[PDB]
Symmetry: D4
Subunit: 162 residues, 8 copies
């Protein structure tokens, strides 16, 4: 089970969201590491994490932050690996700040952005799977079964009065 | 060889999506560009998405505005990564576009980029970052692209 | 006869859409209710929309939240009137749902109602206003519904208890 | 025959609402068009709404901007389906118009469409989708409209 | 003497509008309270507005939420000053209420206050400021209300 | 009889606030107009508010944009009714103006009108409704203003040419 | 030695502004904390601002919600740096507070921080970053606060706990 | 003497940040101005921030648009006060810029000013209010600026002036 995804977040308070990303990676049998890496409070460590990611065997980085969420964009500035950004739902502005701070990157350094909150955490994992499946048969199979399952679940339960 | 499918809901999106295509050309990445309407050509859209993998595509980049459903619906019908570009809408300046693309519930992801030209450029660059993993020439091209933009700023520090 | 199809992207929408169904029952309008996911069951969605007219449906009421594509994609595949109900999302309180539904470009319309339960109820009542033109029992039932809600306000004019 | 009432809050709304009327013309749907202000002509508004059904109208399409009350207040006074078109306001780009029309509490519905010209067009097309059940030529005109818009995109795939 | 009409779109608005009525009581201003639904009782609404002046009302205070049409529609049918209170809506936190009331085009004004209880309270205080010119007792009651809220803060500088 | 004070934070607001003054002229209501800056002339703003009532004013109409503090701060310093006009700001289209005026907490009210010229016109008309109960000529003028605007619509029902 | 004035429009802002005071205490910075309402005590607010420099204050931190005018109005009446903290309003979650503080037109600046407790804490830290220039003990306290927060994240990399 | 560093993410920010520099010029405040991109020149940004205090800078004014990370990331790497100017973006009129700058979590502050030109001017004036404590000539210049702006309004009370 090779470690192919780095899941990183600006603070421990982002874990209730980011754990849902790790849960999907676990369910899909994808190897990952999870770490608190703060753009603001540990900037030098953030640069190091990004700089070394490729040589460490990582293929995708998933980064979550809230508020003025700079972590995903700053990582993306320092690696050519694909970076996925998860806007963590802020208590004040409901992740609207997080979302704009991540998605509105000017041209040159992209961050793939997903839905605010847990929906986006889970979707970032599934999207990472969608990238990794091209060179990992186990992942292709696990992702296909995931999608087959979610389709089957709706088809088998059509009546909402159940 | 055609590895990226660049699609958009209408011809009016071309002024945005052309910038995505310009980057793929610059990086030596094969692509096709096509108008595919989720609302006006729903059957073609389903067929496009269903056949993408077997036609050799590795990534789909989809642009739409307003109630922008094209990226999410293509994503529902292919296992390939789909990148969504919110097109700047005349009434709400892409606010509608962005929310309609990015706020996908858990299960079917769409990787979303900035509203407008910025997003169209970054989706192309992100596609390059997916494709570089198995293509040396693309890794080199993307590395050079980044060096070029870095150099442009470093060699032009005085804003006057 | 079944004249209205009430559909929703997920079972989590039933707490909103059951309020639609409650009004159709009160007005004696025939309907079916079903979970039809635009993202997880896209094929069934197309099939449902494609055949609704030949099945005898005259209106479709479709609820969805977040990036809410169900109403619009149904409307792309049927010439029947499609009524869209934006389900109140947990992050953005239905703002995403509303914009995702109402901001349809010219060519394929979706009639949109208020976010949440209010919209669900109103879609049912709007369906009644479409169907009363060829059904006298529905006309009477709607006239009575409107007369009763008017009486309720009039019967209790001063809200002070003391 | 006149089956659609197209009303608007002020003459300044006509650059938007004319786009509704153009689609109605194209589909062969008879209509009347009038300026009916909720705030400047409230009695005329109530009168218009009250008699619409008895005058043979089947659908009312109402456009207004800003604090846009015309659609909702018409809907309050007719049992006919009322379609609401939020006009693009100069200050807030129709966000006021949109919320003022779509956010009706339970009991009196207004079917709401996109802000601006897009919603004006879509209101016309939705009126057609209501009227097609009882009218063959309208059913035909709407089928042909949809077929032609689909063909136009299929014929023009290269941007 | 009943000089202020306090009206509201539904009974559920009473939790907000009660706060308006409380201030009018504290200032010794006569008022009436009534549920008047723009949408469910439109004829009653027109009759309320048409007869207000002849009934001796001087100010109307109208609360409503969502697509809040009551204040504007009353203002269209009376030349009396109409104060609007956007009631805090469950979905959009009164943003719909606020725009629906404040964004009246030129011709028929509605004086608009804060969303929720704050605005309800302030509409009552503003009614007092309109009426003060015609009654020394209301003028004194309002001056005293202000004097008291000022003294309450000066006397309590320490938040600790 | 100068009964209404029309004030604004800056000269750049005059294109909006002149429309308020135009209605007051049309209705025969006496007024004065002045540039009074809450941030650049705070002392003058306090003095203006403090002395309004003794100077004969009955209503103050105040326009400002951005972080629009003039209406609320004038209302803090006079017992007279204050009418606030959110001026359309260049960056946020008067969203900032509107929230900065209307969202006064309980205790000190400001009657707020629509963003821009619409609000400026409507503040003047609202001032007229406050004052009409005082001069039969103002009541008549306001009633005529409404009749004329109604007549423009009733006599011109067809938007098509 | 009292160098920072921490003021707020109402006592209900204390659960937010207390977090500012906690940081100033931890950094050893002298402060005073007072309720000063721009709308209910406008004269006191003018006098506070006018005499702040005389009283030895170097920075003023001002919190307010809703139509939040306290920071801008203090800034109009002192040349001392004024830091604005937008308090989280119950209706609009501090959006009104934020726009009312930050969108000051050119001429009278207010340094604005995040909505709510994060902004209260940051205003205190920012005040420290002003005072460190002429106070070596404050320079050292701030440097260590930042080293402490950095070390804590570095020592706790694992989000499981 | 150079006491203020004025930096901006891109040359397109100059039409806004030039207004900051104009005020600094008018007040007699020494500054330097440079394009420093958080995303395209991250190492240079870090270097600029790290060395600012030892180069004799006392205040940094940073402007950026969109997902505006420059001010926060500079603030993470210097103990000096950082002033943030949200540049008015084409799409979202600086709403993204503003949230990206002002919504910094606790620990690393950025003093934020109004969106656009107003904020650039105000950042310059706020820098002056920091520097006035140890620079007599700056104190005099800022006092004169405030007196003049007050005078201008007092001397032009009638908006009908022509
Ligand atoms: Cl570090
Ligand atoms: Cl097709
Ligand atoms: Cl689309
Ligand atoms: Cl399916
Ligand atoms: Cl959906
Ligand atoms: Cl209207
Ligand atoms: Cl009634
Ligand atoms: Cl209402
Ligand atoms: Cl002065
Ligand atoms: Cl102001
Ligand atoms: Cl006082
Ligand atoms: Cl305040
Ligand atoms: Cl660099
Ligand atoms: Cl940046």
């Amino acid at each position: 089970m090779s470690v192919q995804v780095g899941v990183i977040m600006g603070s421990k308070s982002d874990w209730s969201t980011m754990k849902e990303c790790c849960d999907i990676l676990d369910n899909l049998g994808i190897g990952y590491e999870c770490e608190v890496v703060s753009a603001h409070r540990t900037p030098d460590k953030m640069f190091d994490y990004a700089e070394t990611a490729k040589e460490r065997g990582l293929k995708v980085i998933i980064a979550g932050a809230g508020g003025a969420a700079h972590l995903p964009g700053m990582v993306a500035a320092k690696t050519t690996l694909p970076v996925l950004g998860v806007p963590v739902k802020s208590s004040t502005l409901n992740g609207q700040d997080s979302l704009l701070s991540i998605v509105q990157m000017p041209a040159g350094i992209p961050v793939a952005t997903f839905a605010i909150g847990m929906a986006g955490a889970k979707n970032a994992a599934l999207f990472a799977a969608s990238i990794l499946q091209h060179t990992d048969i186990n992942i292709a199979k696990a992702l296909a079964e995931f999608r087959a399952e979610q389709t089957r679940f709706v088809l088998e339960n059509p009546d909402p009065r159940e």
